[PDB]
Design a protein around this ligand. Structure first.
Ligand SMILES: [Mg+2]
Ligand SMILES: [Mg+2]
Ligand SMILES: [Mg+2]
Ligand SMILES: [Mg+2]
Ligand SMILES: [Mg+2]
Ligand SMILES: [Mg+2]
Ligand SMILES: [Mg+2]
Ligand SMILES: [Mg+2]
Ligand SMILES: [Mg+2]
Ligand SMILES: [Mg+2]
Ligand SMILES: [Mg+2]
Ligand SMILES: [Mg+2]
Ligand SMILES: [Mg+2]
Ligand SMILES: [Mg+2]
Ligand SMILES: [Mg+2]
Ligand SMILES: [Mg+2]
Ligand SMILES: [Mg+2]
Ligand SMILES: [Mg+2]
Ligand SMILES: [Mg+2]
Ligand SMILES: [Mg+2]
Ligand SMILES: [Mg+2]
Ligand SMILES: [Mg+2]
Ligand SMILES: [Mg+2]
Ligand SMILES: [Mg+2]
Ligand SMILES: [Mg+2]
Ligand SMILES: [Mg+2]
Ligand SMILES: [Mg+2]
Ligand SMILES: [Mg+2]
Lengths: 53, 207, 113, 120, 118
RNA sequence: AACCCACUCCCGUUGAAAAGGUAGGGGAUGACUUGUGGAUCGGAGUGAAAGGCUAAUCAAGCUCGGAGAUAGCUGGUUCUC
RNA sequence: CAGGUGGUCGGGUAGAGAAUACCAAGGCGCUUGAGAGAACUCGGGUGAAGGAACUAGGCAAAAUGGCACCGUAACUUCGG
RNA sequence: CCUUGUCGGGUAAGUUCCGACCUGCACGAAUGGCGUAACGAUGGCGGCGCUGUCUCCACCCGAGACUCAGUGAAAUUGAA
RNA sequence: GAUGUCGGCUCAUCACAUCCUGGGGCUGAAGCCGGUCCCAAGGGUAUGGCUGUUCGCCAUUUAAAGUGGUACGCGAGCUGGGUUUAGAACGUCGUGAGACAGUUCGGUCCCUAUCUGCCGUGGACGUUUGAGAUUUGAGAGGGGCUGCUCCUAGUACGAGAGGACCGGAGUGGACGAACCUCUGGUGUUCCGGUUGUCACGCCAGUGGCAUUGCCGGGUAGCUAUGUUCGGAAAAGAUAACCGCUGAAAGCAUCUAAGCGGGAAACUUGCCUCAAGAUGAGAUCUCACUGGGAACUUGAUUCCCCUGAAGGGCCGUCGAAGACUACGACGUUGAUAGGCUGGGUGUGUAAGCGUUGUGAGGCGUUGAGCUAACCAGUACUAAUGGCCCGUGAGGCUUGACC
């Protein structure tokens, strides 16, 4: 179906109040001091102080 | 009062006469008393009850101190039973000794949850046809309300969603056997919830 | 194991070793008229479960020109005796194909003696 | 037998050869009828000369069915083919002899005749 | 409803799902390291491990049974000769899964599957 | 079966498609099907005849002029005291 | 752009066959993917006991379907 | 039209179907009248088999739907 | 400048002028049965043949197969059987085009839900220092149905026929909830049979594709056709009704005062949610006890040091689940995967050796394989990491050394 009246700025912006981002699962490698996602192989290829690739 | 145990699957036992008695085996750890809520300090009267085997790393310091007033070293969960008149000390042990043969009981517990159920499954609605010209609608709900002057949909309308794990109680199930050695209760009938769950056993008031 | 352990107490030896395709005879208790008696039910076994206490077999009999198949519980005290009169090779677990064959076509072969 | 418009033969000598259920007696709307339950049948195919004519409304009791009868146990007697026994205006049988087996779950105070007359 | 049902469809039919793990194992037993998707790696450990366990007993019947499900001469040769003897005293756990970021084109959680000793 | 046609259910209806698709269906040596070229045109042609077809438009097309047709009928008609 | 577009070559194994099921030569992975595996829709597989009681109507679905032999009724324009 | 006219058959029950009655409002002989084998993607009934059509739906398999990343319309809309 | 018209299916909600069940008055009500009229809406209130039909007539039940409203409920939930646009035909009217609320065949039913409404499930903040856990119940939902047999008793009543009131015991139908112990279904992830064809250098053995190629079975899970349970008992106030004392009106009088009995209705009693019940309730326990400056003084603001109780992130997952949310576990370790012993399902695996010319049979022979089931085991994967959440909890009055 279609609408009978357009939604105003307040009504539109209220809907997208629950639309945010969060990925703060970072961790610092003990050896290389490289930032990486937790429980993930680091971009260089180290996981808990061990080269794997 | 009542007893908290675990559902552990159903079984069957045969008497000497020959009839088959479907049985639900309920494991009961010995239950410790955590509190005795007197009337003067709390209004109503009730007793807390707890099962065991929770690791020390999973209990908060507040709960550890709560289980320190009575030397319980308590475990998972805390349950409370309302009772008429019976004294209980801070540290006590509630076992299956209060039950006997017969002794119809009420068995509660979280039922097995269906993810998101339709109206045919949740409310036992009847479906439309399947061949006689029917359009895509084969299992969907039909009408909701009247045309012009309800002006809306009446609250409490039966619609689809979440045949859930909400608490439900089967009424007046008779106990077949009580084991004071293995700490088991044999209940004649079904028990809500899956095996390995949590179940509450209380004397039946409906009689 | 608690449910696997309760069943062991109800298990008491009542049956011999048998398999599908045998022609067993079963003695079943009859409680009628305030007098207990046995009754002979002879047929051909067509199914078997081996769950433990939840074990059951199905035996097919042709009585008065009418077929009849009776499912029996293995460890019930109603099933008193179980004797094997014939055993033959069928190389299959469930002989449900015999529900259609009646006479000479429904003969159990004999490779096993 | 177990539903309206359910063809079944009869277990009787003076009856027809095939009858059809038309009403399951009992409560408001009984969907099913087991062994030992009264039904209302219509004669669909009669023997060349018996006692019940073709196309007659009679009352019958179900004695066999492929669904089987369930006792207070995990054991069920399951036949292969349905059957019924006709009844008069009163609930006694019409014929004399009964063909095929019957079940001992049926015998009540009111059905001591057909159970005695049938070879089980 | 999925209550205690094991195995994930991955939006593939049964034959594609079988043939995909059959071709993932045969590739894993050539390179000993694969950059694959995490859900595909969580199911690959239920296919390669039975083959590695089967490889610990050399026999004509065992080699034929292995070939029947990982059909490749090179993989059967790699088994029974290098694998199954290296892991002759390791009870289970023949490979590990290490999550590795996300995919570039899509966002698919990738994971490295690596044999435990290499 | 190719080929032609389109009897039935479902899907699709903002579709992959301004008339289709998966299943089933009728003719399939003939009053057949089809490639190339040509003839019949607007109160005029063709029509195993439906008022069907005549470039997605048909109880008489498309385009340009009479023409800004005519409308006793709708709608609209803008600064102040 | 699941549509329309005239004509030639057109292999192997089974099969009467240019049908149908697999392959050779040759060409393709159909220009968004990865997850989980609720309702509901679409295209399908199986079904305890009944067997059209559903419905405006056996609509849809289910079942038969091949080669050899035997045998085949009312009627008939004497072909069927 | 009165009309589900009256009788019979089929079914337990038949405004539908088939065979008769003649009181044919308003049949009728080349706008053809009665019959007719074979032919019908034709209309209306009845029978065998068959079955999820239906009692009453239950499970399972793929494409949707739901979550993540990219691209990204629609009709409607006096203001909320 | 459009409110889609009759029937059918799905889904219901409301009135009582009530069809059954419930409590009563009168009766030309002996009993069993009935007729009529008050109170009562708590729950129920049928399957078919015909017809497009609602309606109606039929055969068979049931305790009963209620009357109406709700656009003669319900097409942005489904059909298009009826009326019904275009084609065709019968009868009648009209010379004719054509017409008939006279008949018969055929005939496209669109929308991805923005805002009210409803079924579910989450995020933010508040409840006055902050957390973990349990909870009273303001209030709202769920349920309420009923037949048939036996004892009282063949007693009362009735010439006889015929036959209870009240009370007690048993097991049935419809409905609802829960669960796989059983009986089945499914179980394209387990084991076998086999047709066509391709392939592994060939024999054997095996694997693709042919709807899972076609099937025979089947673990867990799910499921009903299976297993169990429920409708109450009891208390209070009452409707109709039955009254006791009692005058007004020396009698009488159920009422004016007063005192009772009183039915599925009402309120408790049985089950679930329920302090966003901004009136935000209540018990147990745990955590924080350092300074400096400006400006104003519940004193406010800022700088440093501190970050506890716990929560979140993340990971292994769940009989929890659309996303969430909820439950368990992260080496203080059995949360998931694997491995070893079991159980189940399937059915004598492959290969060795003999009989036969050969298919085939035989020690090989309960062997082999065996998803989701149980027990054990750190072999693998869950990192002695990061972010939130602070530093003693404002002011008045009374008791209180
Ligand atoms: Mg669940
Ligand atoms: Mg459909
Ligand atoms: Mg509407
Ligand atoms: Mg209003
Ligand atoms: Mg035979
Ligand atoms: Mg396939
Ligand atoms: Mg062409
Ligand atoms: Mg064709
Ligand atoms: Mg045109
Ligand atoms: Mg103009
Ligand atoms: Mg002019
Ligand atoms: Mg060819
Ligand atoms: Mg079936
Ligand atoms: Mg069947
Ligand atoms: Mg019908
Ligand atoms: Mg009907
Ligand atoms: Mg059809
Ligand atoms: Mg003519
Ligand atoms: Mg308008
Ligand atoms: Mg009234
Ligand atoms: Mg009440
Ligand atoms: Mg209406
Ligand atoms: Mg529609
Ligand atoms: Mg016309
Ligand atoms: Mg070979
Ligand atoms: Mg291929
Ligand atoms: Mg509070
Ligand atoms: Mg801490």
């Amino acid at each position: 179906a279609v609408q009978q009246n357009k939604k105003s700025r307040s009504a539109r912006d209220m809907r997208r109040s629950h639309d945010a981002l969060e990925s703060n699962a970072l961790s610092v490698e003990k050896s290389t001091g490289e930032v990486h996602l937790r429980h993930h192989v680091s971009p260089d290829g180290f996981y808990r102080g061990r080269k794997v690739v | 009062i009542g007893v908290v145990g675990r559902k552990c699957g159903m079984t069957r036992i045969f008497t000497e006469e020959g009839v088959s008695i479907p049985v639900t085996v309920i494991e009961v750890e010995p239950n410790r008393v955590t509190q005795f809520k007197t009337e003067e300090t709390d209004g109503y009267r009730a007793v807390q009850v707890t099962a065991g085997e929770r690791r020390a790393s999973r209990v908060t310091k507040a709960q550890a101190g709560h289980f320190a007033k009575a030397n319980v070293a308590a475990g998972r969960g805390v349950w409370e039973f309302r009772l008429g008149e019976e004294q209980y000390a801070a540290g006590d042990q509630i076992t299956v000794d209060l039950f006997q043969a017969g002794q119809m009981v009420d068995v509660t517990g979280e039922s097995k949850g269906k993810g998101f159920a339709g109206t045919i499954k949740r409310w036992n609605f009847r479906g439309q046809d399947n061949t006689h010209g029917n359009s895509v609608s084969h299992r969907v709900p039909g009408s909701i309300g009247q045309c012009q002057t309800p002006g809306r949909v009446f609250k409490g309308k039966k619609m689809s969603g979440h045949l859930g794990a909400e608490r439900v109680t089967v009424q007046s199930l008779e106990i077949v056997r009580v084991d004071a050695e293995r700490n088991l209760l044999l209940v004649k009938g079904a028990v809500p919830g899956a095996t390995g769950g949590d179940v509450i056993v209380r004397p039946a008031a409906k009689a | 194991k608690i449910i696997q352990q309760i069943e062991a107490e109800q298990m008491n030896k009542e049956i011999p070793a048998f398999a599908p395709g045998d022609t067993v005879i079963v003695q079943v208790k009859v409680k009628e008229g305030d007098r207990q008696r046995l009754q002979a039910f002879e047929g051909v076994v067509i199914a078997k479960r081996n769950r433990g206490l939840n074990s059951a077999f199905t035996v097919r009999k042709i009585s008065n020109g009418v077929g009849v198949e009776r499912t029996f519980q293995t460890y019930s005290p109603i099933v008193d005796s179980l004797s094997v009169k014939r055993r033959g090779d069928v190389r299959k677990a469930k002989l449900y194909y015999l529900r259609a064959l009646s006479g000479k076509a429904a003969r159990i072969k004999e490779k096993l003696v | 037998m177990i539903q309206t418009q359910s063809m079944l033969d009869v277990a009787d000598n003076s009856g027809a050869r095939r009858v059809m259920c038309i009403k399951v007696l009992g409560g408001s709307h009984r969907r099913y009828a087991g062994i030992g339950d009264i039904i209302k049948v219509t004669v669909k195919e009669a023997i060349p000369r018996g006692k019940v004519k073709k196309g007659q409304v009679m009352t019958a009791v179900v004695v066999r069915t492929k669904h089987g009868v369930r006792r207070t146990d995990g054991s069920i007697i399951r036949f292969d083919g349905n059957a019924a026994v006709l009844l008069n205006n009163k609930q006694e049988p019409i014929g004399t002899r009964i063909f095929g087996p019957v079940t001992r779950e049926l015998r009540t105070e009111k059905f001591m005749k057909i159970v005695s007359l049938a070879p089980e | 409803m999925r209550h205690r049902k094991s195995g994930r469809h991955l939006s593939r039919t049964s034959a594609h799902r079988k043939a995909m793990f059959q071709n993932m194992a045969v590739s894993l037993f050539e390179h000993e390291l694969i950059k694959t998707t995490l859900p595909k790696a969580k199911e690959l450990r239920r296919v390669a491990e039975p083959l590695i366990t089967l490889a610990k007993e050399d026999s004509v019947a065992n080699r034929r049974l292995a070939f029947d499900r990982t059909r490749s001469k090179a993989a059967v040769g790699k088994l029974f000769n290098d694998l199954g003897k290296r892991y002759a005293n390791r009870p289970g756990g023949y490979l590990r899964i290490l999550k590795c970021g996300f995919r570039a084109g899509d966002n698919a959680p990738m994971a490295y599957v690596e044999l435990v000793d290499r």
